[PDB]
Amino acid sequence: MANCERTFIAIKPDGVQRGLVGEIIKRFEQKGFRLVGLKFMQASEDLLKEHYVDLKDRPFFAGLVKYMHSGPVVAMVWEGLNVVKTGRVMLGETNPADSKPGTIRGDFCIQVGRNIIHGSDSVESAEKEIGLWFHPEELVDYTSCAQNWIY
Amino acid sequence: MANCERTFIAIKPDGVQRGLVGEIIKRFEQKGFRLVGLKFMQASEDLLKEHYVDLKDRPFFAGLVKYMHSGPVVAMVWEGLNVVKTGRVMLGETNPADSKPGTIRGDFCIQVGRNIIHGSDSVESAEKEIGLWFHPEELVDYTSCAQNW
Amino acid sequence: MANCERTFIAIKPDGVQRGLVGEIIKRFEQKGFRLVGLKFMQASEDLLKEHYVDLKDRPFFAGLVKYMHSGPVVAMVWEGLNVVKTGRVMLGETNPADSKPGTIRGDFCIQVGRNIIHGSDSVESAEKEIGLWFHPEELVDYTSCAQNWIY
Amino acid sequence: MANCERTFIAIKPDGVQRGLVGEIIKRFEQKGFRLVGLKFMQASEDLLKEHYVDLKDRPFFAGLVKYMHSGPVVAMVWEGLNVVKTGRVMLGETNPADSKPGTIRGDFCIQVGRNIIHGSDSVESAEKEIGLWFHPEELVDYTSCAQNW
Amino acid sequence: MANCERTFIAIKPDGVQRGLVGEIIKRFEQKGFRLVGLKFMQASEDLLKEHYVDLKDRPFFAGLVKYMHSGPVVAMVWEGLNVVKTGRVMLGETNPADSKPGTIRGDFCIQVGRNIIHGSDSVESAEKEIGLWFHPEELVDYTSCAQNWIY
Amino acid sequence: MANCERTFIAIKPDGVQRGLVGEIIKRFEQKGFRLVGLKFMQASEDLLKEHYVDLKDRPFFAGLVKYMHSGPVVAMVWEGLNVVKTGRVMLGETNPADSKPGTIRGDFCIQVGRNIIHGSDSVESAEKEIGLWFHPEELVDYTSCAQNW
């Protein structure tokens, strides 16, 4: 079903450092989304280079990979109706001056470069990102959506 | 240092089910403890059996394994000074009738059998539980404590 | 006065089931609105049929009445300046994909059909709905607005 | 079953006045207890008198009725296992100087006389209070406990 | 730096009376702004007259000064990137019917005249207002921004 | 009246640092206590020395002054009935291992030395601390208690 849609959400090293892991997870929880993947990791540069490949050229890339490599990240896969579209809305617009109070970036980050959180911008982008961060065994299902989430 | 003590907290299937994961995590972060391991898994019978092996002959064993296997759980290693003893106080005492408001069990569970959460009861149980539930490459430490451990 | 305006808010069976009654009431409370009616009820089909009469024809009607009949609802009357207009804003837009973080539907529901909450869309609609759900004795006043709330 | 025990909680006029209704409700929901009765009323003298009838000869009787009548209150029946005993712990002990942070009185009231909230002290007081404050058609049960009661 | 920008925020007597001081401060805190001034005061009429000088003529002025004089105010100076622009956003639009859920006025005030909170609308206006409410000694710095905040 | 008792709470540099000021304030407001003094300052050595003068010969004196001076703190006078005794309960006992979840230390500090917060331990310490940290024109009272004090 469409209610088997999945999105990738990462909490970057400053989100963790500022003790926001509980608060962020809790927001998805009370929305009514289902957790299907959760993992705490030190991301390899390889992974980060691949993740940020579309920007492998721009000047900021090096320091950006460095930031993400610099601390633990929380990797998450959340499941539910329009979870990609709604998920971006819950995060707020990427720019931390356009982010409205009540969204995550809205209530919580100021710095545009070294922010708190990432979200998939499309269903395609999510599948790509879930592939990259998660092995298929680390995705637990029990929502009988696993048999529908094929592409 | 003594500030490198680690303890293991599990959120049992009901806790995940009831949507209490973030809340539970929030309490530990805001107390000041360091997250050094966090995963979402379906516990295997082989793991659950090894984990509860001191109870393997009690009559409720099979059903307790069946409970813990029945849904995904969240496993966690937290770090800090007296994090084991302190973590036991934050959950509240094992029996959710003796549990006090302000603790996790106090605020959140009613049933004694299927309850919300588990925490290590000793540094030794912690070492054992931790190694049982996490491969050592799964741990993430940056706190310059990893060496001490 | 205009500050004797009243609106009807219902928490539907899933709002109750998901343990959101405290959180929803508390939002009106801290806004500075006054509670003048609160009641926990199993709605009769008659009541629900009358409530949803404008849609007594559309296909979804039957299952919609069924949902509302299927569990306890919390009925509320809140009082205060522009409480109808502001009340809809606090709920968010009815569609759970347009609902912004920080509103009730925003933070809390995903499913468009079986949602969490209802609010009056007009002062007329409120009077109609308050009539329907509440007996005049179940409206407690102590805000000296009872003598002004005549239409 | 024992999981069909009901208890009565009232939020006295100050509690409503101070905007604490939702918060108070939130604590019971999140503990896991079932709401099976909830109304907003002006308590009558005739009801308040019958309710506090064990105190009808103490010197403060009249004024205590006058307090409870002076503003609308929120009445509630909650359901669950040990909900009476457990509900007493969540409010904190009757005297708001012995009350502990994390309990409702602890977090919210200062004055001993006019305080925030009332809870039943026994299954018997609960049955009595409940029937006194609610007609039985006012209760809403779906939890397949209604029969047990 | 631009990250030494400062804004003035006042909590008016009703914000205090309604016990909202913790909640308001906490919102700036979790945003990631730095407190550089905080003071609890009974404002002189002189101060208030000067503050509200641009409206020293309009009819509402007298009662408006009276309100602000009528109770304790909390005066605050917060520091950080775009703290003036972001600060207004965190407050919500000044009119309490346009204020969106999730902002401070949004979640918390209804009355347009006697509201909860004030925020600077510009960097100029902030400097003016900080001058007026704060002596330079009451501004504590420890963010090494004091040496940059010159105009 | 007895409802005019004042007590002094300081938030030490770590508390401000960790972003806990609002939260801490929220607890006192929501309990019902009146804010009658609130400032954000760098404490001087001369003040900190006078404040901790009963400890001036212990070996940790110098370093404790250095801690309290190392960053800005938030000073507060709160008003109400038993606000000193009650305020001590809300913080939790001085040693953050005996502290209970639901109290401020319980929920928020781990380290015993550098901790989050201070509260007066007696009406007399309160009077002394208050006058030490606040000039009397800095206090704001409207509660018709100012006279009583």
Side-chain angles (χ1 to χ4, degrees), chain F residues 31-105:
Chain F
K31 171 67 147 183
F33 287 127
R34 227 71 184 258
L35 193 60
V36 304
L38 175 80
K39 59 203 260 193
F40 187 72
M41 57 198 300
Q42 170 138 312
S44 84
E45 315 213 16
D46 280 3
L47 166 59
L48 290 174
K49 277 173 189 154
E50 183 52 60
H51 175 247
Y52 286 105
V53 81
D54 301 274
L55 313 174
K56 82 164 320 187
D57 262 284
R58 309 259 262 124
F60 54 87
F61 182 74
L64 169 118
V65 165
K66 186 196 196 190
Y67 166 51
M68 291 282 303
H69 184 66
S70 78
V73 310
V74 168
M76 295 178 270
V77 184
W78 289 90
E79 194 161 63
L81 193 235
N82 280 38
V83 74
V84 171
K85 194 111 65 70
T86 293
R88 279 186 75 214
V89 165
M90 290 175 38
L91 301 215
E93 32 243 353
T94 15
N95 189 277
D98 305 315
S99 277
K100 300 302 197 313
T103 66
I104 292 176
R105 289 182 207 286

Side-chain angles (χ1 to χ4, degrees), chain B residues 18, chain C residues 11-24 108 116, chain D residues 22 25-35 78:
Chain B
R18 297 221 265 133
Chain C
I11 304 173
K12 308 171 179 178
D14 288 6
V16 178
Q17 178 62 28
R18 293 216 270 135
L20 287 175
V21 177
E23 179 60 47
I24 286 163
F108 295 124
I116 290 327
Chain D
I25 288 173
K26 187 163 163 200
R27 301 226 181 170
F28 284 82
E29 281 173 310
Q30 94 189 355
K31 171 67 147 183
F33 287 127
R34 227 71 184 258
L35 193 60
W78 289 90

Side-chain angles (χ1 to χ4, degrees), chain B residues 9-30:
Chain B
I9 279 73
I11 304 181
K12 307 183 186 168
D14 279 5
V16 171
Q17 172 60 34
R18 297 221 265 133
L20 287 161
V21 170
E23 177 58 59
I24 286 178
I25 288 173
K26 187 163 163 200
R27 301 226 181 170
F28 284 82
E29 281 173 310
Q30 94 189 355

